[PDB]
Amino acid sequence: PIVQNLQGQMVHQCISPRTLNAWVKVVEEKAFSPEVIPMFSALSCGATPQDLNTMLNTVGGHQAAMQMLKETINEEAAEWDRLHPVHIAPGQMREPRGSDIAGTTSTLQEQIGWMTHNPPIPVGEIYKRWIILGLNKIVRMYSPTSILDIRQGPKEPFRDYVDRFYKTLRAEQTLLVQNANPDCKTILKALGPGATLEEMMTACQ
Amino acid sequence: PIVQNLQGQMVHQCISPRTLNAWVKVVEEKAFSPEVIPMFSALSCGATPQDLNTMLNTVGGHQAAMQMLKETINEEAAEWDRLHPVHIAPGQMREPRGSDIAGTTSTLQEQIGWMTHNPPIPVGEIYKRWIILGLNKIVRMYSPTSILDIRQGPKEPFRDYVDRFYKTLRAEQTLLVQNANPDCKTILKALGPGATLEEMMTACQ
Amino acid sequence: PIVQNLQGQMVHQCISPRTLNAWVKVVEEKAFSPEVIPMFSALSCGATPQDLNTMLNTVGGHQAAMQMLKETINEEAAEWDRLHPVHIAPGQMREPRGSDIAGTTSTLQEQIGWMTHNPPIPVGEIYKRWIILGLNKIVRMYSPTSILDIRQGPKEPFRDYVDRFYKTLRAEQTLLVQNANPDCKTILKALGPGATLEEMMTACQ
Amino acid sequence: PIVQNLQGQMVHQCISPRTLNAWVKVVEEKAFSPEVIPMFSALSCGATPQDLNTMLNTVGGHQAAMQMLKETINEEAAEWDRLHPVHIAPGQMREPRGSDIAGTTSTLQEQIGWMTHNPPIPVGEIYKRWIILGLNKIVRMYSPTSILDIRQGPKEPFRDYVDRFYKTLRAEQTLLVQNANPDCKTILKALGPGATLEEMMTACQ
Amino acid sequence: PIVQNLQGQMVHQCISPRTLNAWVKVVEEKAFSPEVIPMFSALSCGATPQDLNTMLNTVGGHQAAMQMLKETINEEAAEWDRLHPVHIAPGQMREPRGSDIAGTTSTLQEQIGWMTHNPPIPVGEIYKRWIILGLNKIVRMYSPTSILDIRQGPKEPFRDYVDRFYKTLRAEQTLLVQNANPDCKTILKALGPGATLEEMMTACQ
Amino acid sequence: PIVQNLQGQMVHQCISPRTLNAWVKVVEEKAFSPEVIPMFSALSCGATPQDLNTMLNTVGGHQAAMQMLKETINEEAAEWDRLHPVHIAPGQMREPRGSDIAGTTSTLQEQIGWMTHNPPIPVGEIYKRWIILGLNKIVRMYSPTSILDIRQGPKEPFRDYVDRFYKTLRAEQTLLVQNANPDCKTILKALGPGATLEEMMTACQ
């Protein structure tokens, strides 16, 4: 990534083997569960476009997924050119294209240039925004079942049902009461309006 | 987080993959056991609001819990605005809202600004206070059984009973004697008043 | 590798035991699966030719593979000499041969010289390009089956078929529709032209 | 803790996730075996009172134990006040109470102040002394059996008996000969006085 | 080892517990497989003779091996004296003997002196050359079977045979065709001369 | 330990949790196998007497052993006083006793003083010498069987016998031929005198 030294200067640093290992393992073990996204964002703190491609290209499985991502990334590159066309001067910075932000037509040297520029063109963050929009589309896609089929088991503790409800709800981005079992529906109906989730859960314990 | 370099200056540092891994694993293995809280507080030393959201958003399970937390965080944002309303000047700091402290309406850039300000507005610590108040409410909620149902087994060693008693007592935040078995109740009654826990446990060995 | 200190200077650093361990483990567990290549490239960031030989020479198995690599590396050394022949001056830099870039006839001292030169002769990157061209030839070679034999199981979920299709396709570097089962072929044929992979997969869910 | 930078200054540093993990694991696996204490002391090198509370508060089990510790810590706070009563001046240091050394009534800011003072008030070491005196009381308490019941098995190798003897002896803080079996008692009696443990063990091999 | 600080100076650094652990584990798990040597060389980057003895002396098994190594090291010490005899001056450097390079008759202080000298006497690299020549002799010795007994199974895939061939060949430091099975011998004979290993393997797939 | 910063100065550093973990694990898994000693020496590089006590006091088992060590350490303290008696001056260094080198009667402050003195009194190395002499006595003691009972199995490969021979020989600190089986004795007798171990082992393969 790009990080601050101890003497203030912004400088390139090899992506750590820890960071490389963590991303591949998280993908192995959680596929496209929604919590995976903030894990990506954190593990890619200060990342060059080169670093971002490395993290995506190290995934062995989920290639239907990594192909939809390319589709999404390209749609975002086109839109970028549409908004910032381009026409260089010896030892002068060249403006970036869509394909330059997504690191396919740019060098690490240019990427370090733009991101450390004063003022900086933050190509790492622009690309990451594109990637995250794409990973979100995939998460919604790979949610195994709909919020409509999340109903509480007649013998299912309220808390464990809420957990299923808001798990599903997060993947897809008073239905809680509707889908509740009759025993707990009864108590919730009685609580009146403007009940907090804490109160709802207390009540049904 | 924000940490001191070696040359004195306060500067931003990527949250470590070790720290990211430790929090998710602790939540996996201890759920909302009370000891989890000081583990959160320590693992989030020097954390920006961005860092705090990352640690919460990396949890995959316990979404009933992470939803009550939002409820608690929002109640605290409202109370913040109630106490510090707001109305910016070119390249000048803008005062923070409730949603700015909780990192939903603020940039990492602004967060670094406030926290490194001279004097600093410590938005990281203010947010963490909010989160911890919320995690406490959850711990009390998820205590499996009441201190009233903690009674010593007729064949249960005193020490292992005390451990159950003060485990329960910590989750909920001479009852010890009341709930003791008759053999050990007898000895404790005899010890008279102002007996230390050490003496109580010695006596019953 | 060669890395920047904290005071700006470009300086040699022992290859870390973490990096040494990661490469050998990745080769143990993924053989010449295509995702292995970007893992090599990342783990060898800033690498001297000496460092590159170390990473290759630490592999115990796959010696048919590591022999084809030598064949490829030598073909690239010849081509290098063909393009940059050579004829030294006391305490002056000597131009590098093919065998010098591939680190067989050069010292670590000379390698540090060329790579830190102003302007630098980047022998590490030139060699890595050679190695990667060679590892690619091997990946294609060790793809277990052809894209032609990737057809969807009559009871195989579309998503899991796409994953097999683009796994195979990556190793080898509307056939998707051709190879689809009849139920899903039907729906895809109906979608008309210019359908995105996301739409294709949605449709077949 | 408080540690020296590279430029000499004494400065605060987040407690490492390694250190956090090591203490909790050691307690999991060795309970209050006597060797645990020097492990605590080492893992808490340079620790603020805040750091010390964090290490204690991260333990989930052994709450009878962690309650006796509070009892011991409070007895030591009282004794501290008894010896150093207190009565502040704008931007001037306030003398610490018992509860300030044990980090319950003090800020991290004040703790950093006292410990980096010239001359320093070493509140970290004063607290640690209190804690260690308390953990010792617990170790003695949780020694499973008395030195009197450590006798050598008629078919038990001398060395393995000595190990049991000095294990027990350390937990509790020519009895060796008394408790020896008759075969080895015989040889030891014969060795005369002023025999080294090495000679004793040699003799009985 | 000896490493560069951040301020340029060459300075001594404790051998890391990671490096200590890695060498012992590699020896545990691969014995004197040829790939072990480049692993030694890399793990001992910048090593003092003291560091080299530490790495050898931490091996518990393979003592027939570690004794042949001493034999080889001593033969190299004699040859060193034969080539550089010796006859010191207050606070002046004394020339090194064979036993000084191999770290048996020298202090760490002297080793740091020679290796940081301007110009440096690189006793670490001279010793490592000796050790590696010795470890090579051992690898050849502990090759389980001869290249002559590497023949392709009638039902053995060509690739897996090449792997056995070049594994054996590396330990010992158109025989491929000779030893091939008749089906694959046939195709290889037909390929004519100057066939690349890639072509040979393609052909036999 | 005491280590060099990046700015040259010799300064105290907390013993790492890695180093703490490595020593305890090595003792768990190898007891007093001779290879354990160089592991101790390396893991305790730059160690204060305080650091040395920490490493010994973290061992839970082997207390017969750790008691003989105290016996040995005390014998060495007496001998030290015998050789360097003592009689302090305000803010002036006090000469060390036997008990000061072994860190029982000295502060970490004094230990840092002596070891960083110009010229330094190296109390860490003096103590470590004492400890190592003691651990050696223990290794010899805990060698399970004598070199006299190491004889080659009639069906035991020569190499595996040499390994047993020199394992035993190292613990205790042409007998090889004597103890050889008759088949291999025969060949060795025939080799004549001045045969290298390599030749001996070659011959018997």
PDB file of C-alpha atoms in Angstrom, chain E residues 152 156 158 161 177 180-190 200-201 203-205:
ATOM      1  CA  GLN E 152       8.223 -45.170 -15.709  1.00  0.00           C
ATOM      2  CA  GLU E 156       2.283 -44.151 -14.628  1.00  0.00           C
ATOM      3  CA  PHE E 158       4.573 -39.251 -17.888  1.00  0.00           C
ATOM      4  CA  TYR E 161       7.657 -39.986 -13.799  1.00  0.00           C
ATOM      5  CA  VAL E 177      13.674 -41.424 -22.816  1.00  0.00           C
ATOM      6  CA  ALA E 180      10.402 -44.152 -20.224  1.00  0.00           C
ATOM      7  CA  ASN E 181       7.765 -46.938 -20.713  1.00  0.00           C
ATOM      8  CA  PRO E 182       7.327 -48.362 -24.264  1.00  0.00           C
ATOM      9  CA  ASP E 183       4.133 -46.428 -25.219  1.00  0.00           C
ATOM     10  CA  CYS E 184       5.798 -43.058 -24.313  1.00  0.00           C
ATOM     11  CA  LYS E 185       9.301 -44.226 -25.435  1.00  0.00           C
ATOM     12  CA  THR E 186       7.690 -44.807 -28.917  1.00  0.00           C
ATOM     13  CA  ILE E 187       6.287 -41.185 -29.123  1.00  0.00           C
ATOM     14  CA  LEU E 188       9.557 -39.616 -27.766  1.00  0.00           C
ATOM     15  CA  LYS E 189      11.759 -41.623 -30.233  1.00  0.00           C
ATOM     16  CA  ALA E 190       9.462 -40.253 -33.025  1.00  0.00           C
ATOM     17  CA  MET E 200       8.122 -34.153 -24.662  1.00  0.00           C
ATOM     18  CA  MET E 201       5.442 -33.844 -21.909  1.00  0.00           C
ATOM     19  CA  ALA E 203       3.338 -35.252 -26.659  1.00  0.00           C
ATOM     20  CA  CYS E 204       2.896 -37.936 -23.912  1.00  0.00           C
ATOM     21  CA  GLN E 205      -0.373 -36.425 -22.436  1.00  0.00           C
TER      22      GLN E 205
END
